[PDB]
Amino acid sequence: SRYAPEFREPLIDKEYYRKPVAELTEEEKYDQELKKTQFIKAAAATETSSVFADPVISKFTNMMMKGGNKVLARSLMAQTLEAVKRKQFEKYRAASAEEQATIERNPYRIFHEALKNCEPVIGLVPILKGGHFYQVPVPLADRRRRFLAMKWMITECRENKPRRTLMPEKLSHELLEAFHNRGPVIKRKHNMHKMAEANRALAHYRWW
Amino acid sequence: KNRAARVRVAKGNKPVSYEEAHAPHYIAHRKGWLSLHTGNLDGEDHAAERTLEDVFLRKFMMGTFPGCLADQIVLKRRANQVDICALVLRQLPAHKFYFLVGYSETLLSHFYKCPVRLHLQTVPSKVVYKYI
Amino acid sequence: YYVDWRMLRDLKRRKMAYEYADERLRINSLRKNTILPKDLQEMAGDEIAALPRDSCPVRIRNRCVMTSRPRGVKRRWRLSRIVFRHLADHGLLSGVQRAIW
Amino acid sequence: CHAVHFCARHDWLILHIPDAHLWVKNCRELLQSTHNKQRFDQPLEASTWLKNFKTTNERFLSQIKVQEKYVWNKRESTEKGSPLGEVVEQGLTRVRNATDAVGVVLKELKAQSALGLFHLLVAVDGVNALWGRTTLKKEDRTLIAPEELSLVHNLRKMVKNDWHGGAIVLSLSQTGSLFKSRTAYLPHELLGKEGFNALEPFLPILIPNYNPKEFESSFQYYLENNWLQHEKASTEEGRKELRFLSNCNPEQLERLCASL
RNA sequence: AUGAAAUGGGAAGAAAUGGGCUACAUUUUCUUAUAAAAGAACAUUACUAUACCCUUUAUGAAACUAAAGGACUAAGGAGGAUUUAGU
Ligand SMILES: [K+]
Ligand SMILES: [Mg+2]
Ligand SMILES: [Mg+2]
Ligand SMILES: [Mg+2]
Ligand SMILES: [Mg+2]
Ligand SMILES: [Mg+2]
Numbered sequence: 098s099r100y101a102p103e104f105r106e107p108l109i110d111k112e113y114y115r116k117p118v119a120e121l122t123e124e125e126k127y128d129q130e131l132k133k134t135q136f137i138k139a140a141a142a143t144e145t146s147s148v149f150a151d152p153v154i155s156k157f158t159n160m161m162m163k164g165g166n167k168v169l170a171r172s173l174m175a176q177t178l179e180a181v182k183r184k185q186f187e188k189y190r191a192a193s194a195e196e197q198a199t200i201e202r203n204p205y206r207i208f209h210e211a212l213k214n215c216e217p218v219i220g221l222v223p224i225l226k227g228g229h230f231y232q233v234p235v236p237l238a239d240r241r242r243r244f245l246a247m248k249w250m251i252t253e254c255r256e257n258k259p260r261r262t263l264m265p266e267k268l269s270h271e272l273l274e275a276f277h278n279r280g281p282v283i284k285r286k287h288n289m290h291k292m293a294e295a296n297r298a299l300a301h302y303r304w305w
Numbered sequence: 306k307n308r309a310a311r312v313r314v315a316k317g318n319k320p321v322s323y324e325e326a327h328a329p330h331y332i333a334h335r336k337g338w339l340s341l342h343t344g345n346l347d348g349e350d351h352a353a354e355r356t357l358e359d360v361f362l363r364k365f366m367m368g369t370f371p372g373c374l375a376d377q378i379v380l381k382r383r384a385n386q387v388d389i390c391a392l393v394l395r396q397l398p399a400h401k402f403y404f405l406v407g408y409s410e411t412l413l414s415h416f417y418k419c420p421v422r423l424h425l426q427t428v429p430s431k432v433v434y435k436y437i
Numbered sequence: 438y439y440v441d442w443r444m445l446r447d448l449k450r451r452k453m454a455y456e457y458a459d460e461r462l463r464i465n466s467l468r469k470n471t472i473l474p475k476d477l478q479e480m481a482g483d484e485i486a487a488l489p490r491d492s493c494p495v496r497i498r499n500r501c502v503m504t505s506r507p508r509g510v511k512r513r514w515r516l517s518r519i520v521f522r523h524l525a526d527h528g529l530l531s532g533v534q535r536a537i538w
Numbered sequence: 539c540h541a542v543h544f545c546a547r548h549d550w551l552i553l554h555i556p557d558a559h560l561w562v563k564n565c566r567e568l569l570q571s572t573h574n575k576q577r578f579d580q581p582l583e584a585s586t587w588l589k590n591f592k593t594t595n596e597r598f599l600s601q602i603k604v605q606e607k608y609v610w611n612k613r614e615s616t617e618k619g620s621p622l623g624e625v626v627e628q629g630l631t632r633v634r635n636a637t638d639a640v641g642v643v644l645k646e647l648k649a650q651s652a653l654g655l656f657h658l659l660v661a662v663d664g665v666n667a668l669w670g671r672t673t674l675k676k677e678d679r680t681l682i683a684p685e686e687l688s689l690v691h692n693l694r695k696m697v698k699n700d701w702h703g704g705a706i707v708l709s710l711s712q713t714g715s716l717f718k719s720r721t722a723y724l725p726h727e728l729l730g731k732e733g734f735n736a737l738e739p740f741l742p743i744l745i746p747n748y749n750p751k752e753f754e755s756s757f758q759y760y761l762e763n764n765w766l767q768h769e770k771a772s773t774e775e776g777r778k779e780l781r782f783l784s785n786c787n788p789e790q791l792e793r794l795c796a797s798l
Numbered sequence: 799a800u801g802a803a804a805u806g807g808g809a810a811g812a813a814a815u816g817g818g819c820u821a822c823a824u825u826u827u828c829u830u831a832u833a834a835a836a837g838a839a840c841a842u843u844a845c846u847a848u849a850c851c852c853u854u855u856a857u858g859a860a861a862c863u864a865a866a867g868g869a870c871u872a873a874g875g876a877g878g879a880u881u882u883a884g885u
Contacts, residue, residue: 148770175797310526329526333534345532
């Protein structure tokens with residue numbers, strides 16, 4: 098890295114800086130005073146104070162990008178969100194007043210609740226004990242649990258789709274199916290959890 | 306291990322001059338260039354001919370002053386003038402140096418068709434930068 | 438004495454190409470066009486072929502002037518990579534230094 | 539399209555070319571013309587337009603009647619006096635004659651309009667395609683020119699001011715244009731020297747970006763339909779952000795709001 | 799003569815293996831722009847050869863070389879054990 102270890106990650110929260118001084122906890126108040134005598138990293142090209150920037154969706158975009166084609170990957174995510182909004186508007190208009198209440202037309206809220214439905218609480222680590230490969234039930238961190246949900250989505254759509262279907266049409270159809278706990282990405286989570294019960298007694302081999 | 310132009314370590318009894326002590330990576334950092342011409346500057350011609358002339362001029366001075374050279378010679382080209390600056394030990398009588406200067410200048414001026422001058426600074430003995 | 442017999446043959450190739458440069462230019466000009474009758478061009482195609490083979494300028498090889506090495510030469514100094522490094526690593530090339538960056 | 543609605547409601551005869559770039563590129567069937575062997579016929583391109591022209595002007599297709607005899611084939615011809623609908627019907631029935639039925643329609647309407655029977659709105663969107671370059675190749679793998687094409691040649695007459703009884707409404711579009719820069723919008727840049735001279739004297743009508751009143755009206759329309767579903771979109775900081783990113787451009791605002 | 803010079807040759811696999819290039823496509827194919835956007839293409843020859851072959855051009859004395867077109871199509875449907883690189 099070209100940043101020395103003494104550099105601090107930038108804080109790009111607009112409201113945080115403009116809060117009244119008394120509203121800030123003394124711990125936060127102390128850090129701000131310390132940061133005045135430190136070096137701050139430059140903000141990333143994609144780090145902005147925009148009110149429409151969601152870290153979860155921005156991360157999902159980077160996991161789809163191939164060869165640094167951010168314009169294409171962002172376009173694919175923009176087309177997906179729109180394909181989900183247009184799919185719920187059609188259902189909402191073609192539904193009764195009672196049914197209309199339940200229907201969710203926010204694509205950003207369908208994406209977050211979809212991913213969370215696919216996240217697995219426990220995973221598996223492959224281990225070779227006595228020249229035999231065993232996978233031991235592991236408890237997954239918040240970072241490993243989130244990564245696996247996004248990875249499983251980007252892999253079901255990339256591979257298990259018809260040749261002429263497009264990613265905005267497969268991903269939209271999968272975010273909505275996961276949003277209802279019916280999709281194949283949810284089935285992957287159910288299989289992972291079910292296998293952990295099979296290897297329930299083999300967690301002892303853990304050394305880490 | 307890199308071997309180029311590196312005088313290696315022994316037991317602290319080997320005298321080395323400043324020029325010998327410094328390895329190639331110190332060129333332009335601690336020690337300069339023995340030859341100074343304009344043939345390696347950008348957009349300049351006749352580098353090969355200046356480099357070939359230098360190789361010969363160094364072998365000529367070594368043989369013409371056998372055992373009388375304290376250090377490598379310095380070649381300075383200005384216009385068509387050539388200037389040879391050599392540190393020479395005080396071994397030979399004074400009149401012998403006057404003979405070799407007149408001879409080496411005339412011979413090298415009629416060989417390369419340029420005015421060549423010899424500049425000799427006499428040292429009592431080789432100057433030792435460090436014992437390695 | 439030149440470095441080796443290979444450098445000697447090259448020197449002769451370079452001195453015979455200089456003698457036949459004008460001749461091979463004038464004859465070859467008659468062939469590199471579409472304005473002259475093809476009969477003349479076919480005849481000029483044989484006059485150039487009849488000239489001695491060492492007059493042909495593609496038979497010259499650039500060799501290190503000091504070691505006669507056929508490959509590894511740098512055309513600006515006419516020296517092999519091994520000979521160039523010996524002069525450069527000793528401060529004997531005017532303005533050549535190691536590249537650190 | 540706003541002008542085409544005004545004339546359509548006043549009982550004008552609508553001759554609306556939706557996109558004129560589609561006739562100078564990506565043609566998979568390119569025949570030759572019997573009328574003039576130099577020219578070429580685009581069967582599929584003409585057939586699609588006729589089916590739409592029929593729908594828009596279905597009412598006026600029975601009143602207007604041909605003033606001449608047209609021999610489609612040795613066995614098929616149109617007798618003088620028959621309704622103009624018959625010319626359109628044959629073009630759809632026999633795709634080979636589709637590129638010629640269009641020419642008859644354009645010729646008939648242009649001639650009969652001056653008689654006071656009907657008004658004629660020649661609405662050509664993307665008119666800069668007519669006097670530009672094409673990306674169509676002949677059997678020799680040599681690029682064709684717009685004049686050679688049959689549909690392009692007929693239309694160039696309709697956009698001329700040598701008739702009366704109607705009005706011509708033209709639009710420029712760099713989108714879909716061939717061999718033009720991305721940042722070219724001015725009339726001479728897109729039309730060229732040939733296209734400009736063809737249409738002058740014309741009345742240029744600049745279509746600018748949304749003004750402050752128009753931007754707020756469009757923003758409220760999206761909010762009125764629940765399109766802007768993001769929680770922060772309705773806020774003053776959301777609106778100000780969308781004004782910056784879109785820059786008040788109608789298309790950019792529609793695209794940004796689509797994802798939100 | 800184990801020295802010097804001239805002329806003509808220094809072949810062949812397709813067999814194993816190392817590295818690389820390209821493709822197997824839809825986050826793709828072609829066209830204009832320029833990587834924005836649009837119009838077409840999208841499985842039997844669609845994706846897809848920098849092979850063979852056929853023309854033209856460049857260098858040269860010599861094309862056996864390279865490039866650019868043209869046809870012609872083959873195989874390829876994301877690669878077992880295993881393994882390389884990247885903070
Ligand atoms: K091989
Ligand atoms: Mg020897
Ligand atoms: Mg050569
Ligand atoms: Mg693009
Ligand atoms: Mg093909
Ligand atoms: Mg030739």
